[PDB]
Amino acid sequence: SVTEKVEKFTESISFDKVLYKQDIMGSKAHASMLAHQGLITDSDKDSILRGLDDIERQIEANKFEWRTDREDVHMNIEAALTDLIGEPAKKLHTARSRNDQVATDFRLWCRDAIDTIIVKIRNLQRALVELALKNEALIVPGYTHLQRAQPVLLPHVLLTFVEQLERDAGRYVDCRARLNFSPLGACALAGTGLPIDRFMTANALGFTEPMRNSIDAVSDRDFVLEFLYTNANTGIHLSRLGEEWVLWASEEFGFMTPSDSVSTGSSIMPQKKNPDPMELVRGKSARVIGDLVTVLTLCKGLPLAYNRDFQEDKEPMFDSTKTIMGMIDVSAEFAQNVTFNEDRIKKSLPAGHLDATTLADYLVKKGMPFRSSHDIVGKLVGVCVSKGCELQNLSLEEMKKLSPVFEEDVFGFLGVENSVNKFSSYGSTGSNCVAEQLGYWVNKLNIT
Amino acid sequence: SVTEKVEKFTESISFDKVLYKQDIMGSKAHASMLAHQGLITDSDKDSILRGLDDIERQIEANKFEWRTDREDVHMNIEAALTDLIGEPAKKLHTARSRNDQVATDFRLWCRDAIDTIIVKIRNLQRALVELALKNEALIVPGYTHLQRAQPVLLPHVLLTFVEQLERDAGRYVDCRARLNFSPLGACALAGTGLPIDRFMTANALGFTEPMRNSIDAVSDRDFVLEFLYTNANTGIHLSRLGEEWVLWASEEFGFMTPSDSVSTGSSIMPQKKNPDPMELVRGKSARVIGDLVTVLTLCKGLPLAYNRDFQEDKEPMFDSTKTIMGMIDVSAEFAQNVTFNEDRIKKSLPAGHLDATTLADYLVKKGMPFRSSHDIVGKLVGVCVSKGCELQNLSLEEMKKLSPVFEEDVFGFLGVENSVNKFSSYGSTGSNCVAEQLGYWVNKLNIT
Amino acid sequence: ESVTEKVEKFTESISFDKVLYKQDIMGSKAHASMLAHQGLITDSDKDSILRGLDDIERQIEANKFEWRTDREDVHMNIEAALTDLIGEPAKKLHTARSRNDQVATDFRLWCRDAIDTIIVKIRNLQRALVELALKNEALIVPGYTHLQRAQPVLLPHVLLTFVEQLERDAGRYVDCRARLNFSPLGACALAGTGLPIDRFMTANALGFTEPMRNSIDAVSDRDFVLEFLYTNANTGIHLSRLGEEWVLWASEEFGFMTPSDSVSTGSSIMPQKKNPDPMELVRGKSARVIGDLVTVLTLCKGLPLAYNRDFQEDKEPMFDSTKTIMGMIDVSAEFAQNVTFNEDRIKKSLPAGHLDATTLADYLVKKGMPFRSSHDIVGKLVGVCVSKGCELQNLSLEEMKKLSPVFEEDVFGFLGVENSVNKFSSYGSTGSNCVAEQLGYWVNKLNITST
Amino acid sequence: RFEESVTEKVEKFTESISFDKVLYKQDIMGSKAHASMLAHQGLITDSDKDSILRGLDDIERQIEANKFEWRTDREDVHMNIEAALTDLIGEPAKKLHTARSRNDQVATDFRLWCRDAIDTIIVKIRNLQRALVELALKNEALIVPGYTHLQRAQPVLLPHVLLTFVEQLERDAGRYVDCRARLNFSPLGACALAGTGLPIDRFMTANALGFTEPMRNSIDAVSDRDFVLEFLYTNANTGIHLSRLGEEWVLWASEEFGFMTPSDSVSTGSSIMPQKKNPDPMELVRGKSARVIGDLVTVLTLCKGLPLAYNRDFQEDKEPMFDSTKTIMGMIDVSAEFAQNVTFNEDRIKKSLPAGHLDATTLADYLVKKGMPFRSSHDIVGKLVGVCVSKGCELQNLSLEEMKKLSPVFEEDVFGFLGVENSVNKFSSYGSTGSNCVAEQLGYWVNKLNIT
Ligand SMILES: N/C(=N\CCC[C@H](N)C(=O)O)N[C@@H](CC(=O)O)C(=O)O
Ligand SMILES: N/C(=N\CCC[C@H](N)C(=O)O)N[C@@H](CC(=O)O)C(=O)O
Ligand SMILES: NC(=[NH2+])NCCC[C@H](N)C(=O)O
Ligand SMILES: NC(=[NH2+])NCCC[C@H](N)C(=O)O
Ligand SMILES: O=C(O)/C=C/C(=O)O
Ligand SMILES: [Cl-]
Ligand SMILES: [Cl-]
Ligand SMILES: [Cl-]
Ligand SMILES: [Cl-]
Ligand SMILES: [Cl-]
Secondary structure (H helix, E strand, O other): OHHHHHHHHHOOHHHHHHHHHHHHHHHHHHHHHHHHOOOOOHHHHHHHHHHHHHHHHHHHOOOOOOOHHHOOHHHHHHHHHHHHHOHHHHHHHOOOOHHHHHHHHHHHHHHHHHHHHHHHHHHHHHHHHHHHHHOOOOEEEEEEOOEEEEEEEHHHHHHHHHHHHHHHHHHHHHHHHHHOEEOOOOOOOOOOOOOOOHHHHHHHOOOOEEOOOHHHHHHOOHHHHHHHHHHHHHHHHHHHHHHHHHHHOOOOOOOEEEOHHHOEOOOOOOOOOEOHHHHHHHHHHHHHHHHHHHHHHHHOOOOOOEOHHHHHHHHHHHHHHHHHHHHHHHHHHHHOOEEEOHHHHHHHOHHHOOOHHHHHHHHHHOOOOHHHHHHHHHHHHHHHHHHOOOHHHOOHHHHOOOOOOOOHHHHHHOOHHHHHHHOOOOOOOOHHHHHHHHHHHHHHOOOO | OHHHHHHHHHOOHHHHHHHHHHHHHHHHHHHHHHHHOOOOOHHHHHHHHHHHHHHHHHHHOOOOOOOHHHOOHHHHHHHHHHHHHOHHHHHOOOOOOHHHHHHHHHHHHHHHHHHHHHHHHHHHHHHHHHHHHHOOOOEEEEEEOOEEEEEEEHHHHHHHHHHHHHHHHHHHHHHHHHHOEEOOOOOOOOOOOOOOOHHHHHHHOOOOEEOOOHHHHHHOOHHHHHHHHHHHHHHHHHHHHHHHHHHHHOOOOOOEEEOHHHOEOOOOOOOOOEOHHHHHHHHHHHHHHHHHHHHHHHHOOOOOOEOHHHHHHHHHHHHHHHHHHHHHHHHHHHHOOEEEOHHHHHHHOHHHOOOHHHHHHHHHHOOOOHHHHHHHHHHHHHHHHOOOOOHHHOOHHHHHOOOOOOOHHHHHHOOHHHHHHHOOOOOOOOHHHHHHHHHHHHHHOOOO | OOHHHHHHHHHOOHHHHHHHHHHHHHHHHHHHHHHHHOOOOOHHHHHHHHHHHHHHHHHHHOOOOOOOHHHOOHHHHHHHHHHHHHOHHHHHHHOOOOHHHHHHHHHHHHHHHHHHHHHHHHHHHHHHHHHHHHHOOOOEEEEEEOOEEEEEEEHHHHHHHHHHHHHHHHHHHHHHHHHHOEEOOOOOOOOOOOOOOOHHHHHHHOOOOEEOOOHHHHHHOOHHHHHHHHHHHHHHHHHHHHHHHHHHHOOOOOOOEEEOHHHOEEOOOOOOOEEOHHHHHHHHHHHHHHHHHHHHHHHHOOOOOOEOHHHHHHHHHHHHHHHHHHHHHHHHHHHHOOEEEOHHHHHHHOOOOOOOHHHHHHHHHHOOOOHHHHHHHHHHHHHHHHHHOOOHHHOOHHHHHOOOOOOOHHHHHHOOHHHHHHHOOOOOOOOHHHHHHHHHHHHHHOOOOOO | OOOOOHHHHHHHHHOOHHHHHHHHHHHHHHHHHHHHHHHHOOOOOHHHHHHHHHHHHHHHHHHHOOOOOOOHHHOOHHHHHHHHHHHHHOHHHHHOOOOOOHHHHHHHHHHHHHHHHHHHHHHHHHHHHHHHHHHHHOOOOOEEEEEEOOEEEEEEEHHHHHHHHHHHHHHHHHHHHHHHHHHOEEOOOOOOOOOOOOOOOHHHHHHHOOOOEEOOOHHHHHHOOHHHHHHHHHHHHHHHHHHHHHHHHHHHOOOOOOOEEEOHHHOEOOOOOOOOOEOHHHHHHHHHHHHHHHHHHHHHHHHOOOOOOEOHHHHHHHHHHHHHHHHHHHHHHHHHHHHOOEEEOHHHHHHHHHHOOOOHHHHHHHHHHOOOOHHHHHHHHHHHHHHHHHHOOOHHHOOHHHHHOOOOOOOHHHHHHOOHHHHHHHOOOOOOOOHHHHHHHHHHHHHHOOOO
């Protein structure tokens, strides 16, 4: 059947039912306004409000029957309201279109979602900082080109992700403020000649103020694009977190062991511990980017004002949102269920001459042009490579072959533990510098 | 040769040369800080500053030869500097890596770029508001589903774009603030033991403060992602403006005629005026979306800290920025070179029955319920377009046949001029509301 | 709110991968049959397994089968069910197999089945388009460049454009299916096995062309998913253009097309507003199809060998893309059967625009004029007409002779949109006989009849 | 200071010659074929055709010598060439546009360009396949771990890992062949969108330019950019494969894996840390897969929602396709060079292998072949691996006595199945890592690629 095919193709209730709390809040505000403006009676208002709250209790109770033949969340709720309370229900359509209603509902849902995500992000930040604090003294390699470049403190590495998430949080805060303007009162696109008060409904629904352009009100989906992007950049942070942790849990790296409860394995190979949760965090970054491209492509090239294509805005946003929330929480649980392999890590450090840059710094302190200090440290490392020692084990006499500036104080700058203590610049991996940043984060996240 | 081929593939000068002004700025700051902290001499510093000024001047005069064999902008400048001033140039890279250098320069280039784009947008907002003021009384159909729905004022439609562009500006402003933290002094990834000062360079370069984490400073490209997405959303807006204007320019609409300076024609069919620029504006939103996806995919799943993949960050930001600036400026030129065909728009409006919703509002104000009001107007339009006429041509007698609430004042609410006059909600297309909004924008954009 | 509970909910795939049951069961039976043949299980094990899996297929088809999150995925749901049903022999089904080769085999089969279905749906739409074309076979509309009127074309020529697009689409679908039609089964976790399986037998049993040559490729490859997503996306593009065309044609400004009530919405106070929602949504649905492709491109990029758990994310987007494109195709075909063309509106709009100009130029060139002179003379004459308020065909031969003695009485069979269209003659042109030729080709190839 | 008109500001935005000049060779070939058909069909004189064909050859020679000044005020490649042609030969040049439009001209030119680019890419892919097969041949005996979830799963042969990438690239080559065939139809003679009533022969020009046939629909011929989309997609899939190769080799060149050392000619280093070898070229290969995805999204987004027939938006199809093609050629060629400049660290690889119980599965298969069901065989093997973990030993160090406490089926032939070298010897399924299997596959490839 044609109308049956088209019904199935155009219905949105299968997905848009999740807007129910926002829709009800939006309708209550609309009705309160209508009464205050003299377009309905107080009596009709009290009826609408009590009816809407009854339907809400019914949905919370999983006793509400959603219907395809009723199209969407708005008509499903309006039609049930009418069955419950009679004619007053029909008064909700006064000075209102689904165009402006859906925009209101969807912005309200986004606002609540953003709020939830910020709580989740702070939780992940805390989980990372608690892990940093648990391993504050542990030295690991820092990498460029996935080659060992310099020794860093494990907390400094973890604070990288904590700082990335702070930028994410900042985007979410800016996203929320930009979207917190009311489209309600725009009607189908042009506003109304009826005496509504859009300032009153804006305020009732916690919006900053009403949007100043009704065509903009019904045609705008920037708040969707911005939310999707914010989720995509957040997902990227977590994808790099995931790459990192899948590497650290490999045997080649050997740095991290996940608990049984966040890994899988083999009956016949009992040391194999697969970090499936973080591999899925990495992979789920893909869908979040996909969701963003959807709505970008959707909006491209569309004429004004309202077009049915905009119905396609919701499922990507719901997907993106669900996905990031999962990623954030899973990452936090993973952070709480890993331990570092101190002996394996400490064994691996000596062979990399990670203290070379600290030695070059020593020489630069003593007056040597940097390019000369690097050549000389280069040579010394080659000596250590052939002899199979560390720089720390070279004699002062050996160093004096290359320059007279070397003195006995040089040994305070050699070995990884001394190298780490010698970093001193703001934001560096130095012990006191990392200590300060940790204290800053403890205080900001209210950790105790 | 193997060396030939890897050189060509890894070379970045062919594109990163556009960073020259920022690279020189950053190097003057670093040199001044080195000198202040006793890591180089004042005479070294002075030689470096004059040398760099010389090189900048030579670039501006197109007399500087860029070299593939010098890899990138940083080494191209520093080898030239060495050839100009000798040994002092070689101390410039003390306590500095290309890692922290490039991220600093790119950040500065983005700050400059965002500032330029914000100026371009205000110019386009001005061009739109001026177009609106010139055509303040022109009524056109407002559309849903590309079907005529309500009568609206041309200025109200144009203000939709002005409002969209204002959310864009807000995004540029929020993006610039978040990016304005200094990575300089992170060195390769871990910071340094040399007594630099990161606060002093941050101050000299206009950054709010140093970034708090050295690994984050070298590893982060969020600022690229945020600017690319802001460009993309702006381009989405311009793509809709494009779509509208290709439509308006069509014979089928006949709403607008572009000047010959902004259109192509045909000697055999002299009435064919193609709006090539706006078609290109809509089409160029695609490249800006592609640029965003490039760099999202770039960052996805990369380990810490610096990887050579991050060299791919620059060409997409350059392409996106240049495209959007071109799209903003040609859209303003176009806005300044279009005329509306008032006689043709006027003759099309009557047969719509666009006054129908206004008549319905008239009845709701008289105390009719929503559905009843629609039922009545329903009937009235049949009795009307059965005689190929307009509602305002009906007699009061035939109106009172359908309901007694009709009175003589009803004619004040029929026809599109009256319909437009009767919209009264904030942000509506109503004559007074639109004048209020035009006054707001005239003040905000310092128009005279 | 336990970790095990949180991780279970995040890693479970049964909520979406249950749709592979048919192919999963078909694979497992081919597996068990090969095992028995090769002596790795008894024939009574095989018979016991085939019976059980049929019982389970019936239970699923009857909505009597309880899918379980604690059983993770389709593979483990089914096999745990098989164990509860037949006991010991079910346990032997895992012999010389991994979920790695198993999942790749199942998904390949599902994709081959999905592609066969899409091709049929495309033939349908092609048929609906050619039938609409034949029903409106003599109708003339403007052809557009830059959304400006360029030349007069036959509506059938325009609809055949979309039929030709869809024909390239069907072509990609066939090539895609051919490349994916190689068996991963028997790669095990990634390295293969030392057990005496026969990969040729299972490949043949499952309709695959031959076994894949590399065990590691077999578990790690998702190209078939990428290529099918891309092919859906390009089909989606074509339908988005169709969507945009028809949303314009149903505008009042164009006024070329009226959709039936069954494929439109409207307004009780504005009875002439007819919103073509299905086509707007077809247009809009092309976006999620592009998004699903980007998802899987980004998923695969930069991943090491061989199998990785990120690959679990390949399914939901392929399922979304496939369901979306099938709906887009089916609804377009339905809309093509529920539209009529507003003949008098079209005819009224045509003659202001001078679409016959190029035909008059072609007339002058055949009479010997150089092409540059011909375009200048016709531009001038169209100037005379714009001024006078007329069509070229209403000018007298005396007015044309003012501009060139070349014009003769025969010129009049070259003017007007009906004459214009009859005079196109290049292959693939909008010419009357050309479109007829092309319509015969599609009537033949799609087996269109009048009964 | 020269004050610019509006017309000048707009010309800068809409000019395409800055990028489309790279089509000159296709454009001149298309125009020559056009003129030849014109003369044959009587629409121009043979004298006029000869002048046109000679002027176009001269112009092509001037471009090849870098004596040709491209001009932004001539808009595009088509107009640059034809106005230059008019300046050279005068009036005959003006007959060139008889029965042709830029709409059908550009579509012909870009198809010719794309057909040549695919032909070049196929060659470059065969080269990379050969480089990979020779690296495999030179390292045929070397055993390395095979990973799932970046955890050691099984022992495999290095050649079998490299043949994964050869098999990938063979699918890529198939898509290029299929893509080229589908795009090899001539739009020429569609004119602006509707054809023409002049007596052209579209089959003649199609054959002259190596197309299979003229396209069956004039509107489709000027509106279609499927060939572009399909090429971009094919590039992007190829780029994903090269991104996995990049990821692999960056990991392998790490200290932690320590499997592979690149030559100095394909890596970068550090004077202070002379042992640090960065695989920058393979990092960039991985990175450049991104822009190839971006270029596909560009033209996908571009085509979405556009009405028929030709729109000016379509000029945005050239730059992505040029970028995509250049990038993928670079990634393929550099990958082939990197493959020819790596060596494997045989002692480093070998020292890691023996402690991961990589032989456990091969013991499980031994038990299945002796008649134990799958589930009991894994029970037994998990228990024996359990004893090795505790005793800090390998499986091949267990006694036949200890094993017989779990199951009678154990006999002395069990030790032919244990240890990493035996494990790899025991794989035997078609397409498996067994050495006889891989040998058969290498011979297939050596023959297929005509390696001598
Ligand atoms: N119903 C409607 N828009 C529905 C918005 C809700 C929709 N499910 C969505 O998600 O966009 N608009 C009216 C009014 C109008 O568009 O003029 C109509 O289609 O007639
Ligand atoms: N679980 C697994 N493959 C799962 C394939 C199906 C999965 N639901 C998906 O969707 O990819 N493989 C084994 C074997 C292995 O990877 O070594 C494992 O991870 O332990
Ligand atoms: N360690 C280094 N030399 N890093 C190189 C940084 C500059 C490089 N051209 C880029 O764009 O990222
Ligand atoms: N009507 C025309 N002159 N069309 C121009 C076609 C060539 C154009 N530069 C493109 O790349 O699409
Ligand atoms: O070249 C075009 O876009 C249009 C041609 C025409 O008017 O025939
Ligand atoms: Cl108000
Ligand atoms: Cl100071
Ligand atoms: Cl500092
Ligand atoms: Cl022909
Ligand atoms: Cl086999």
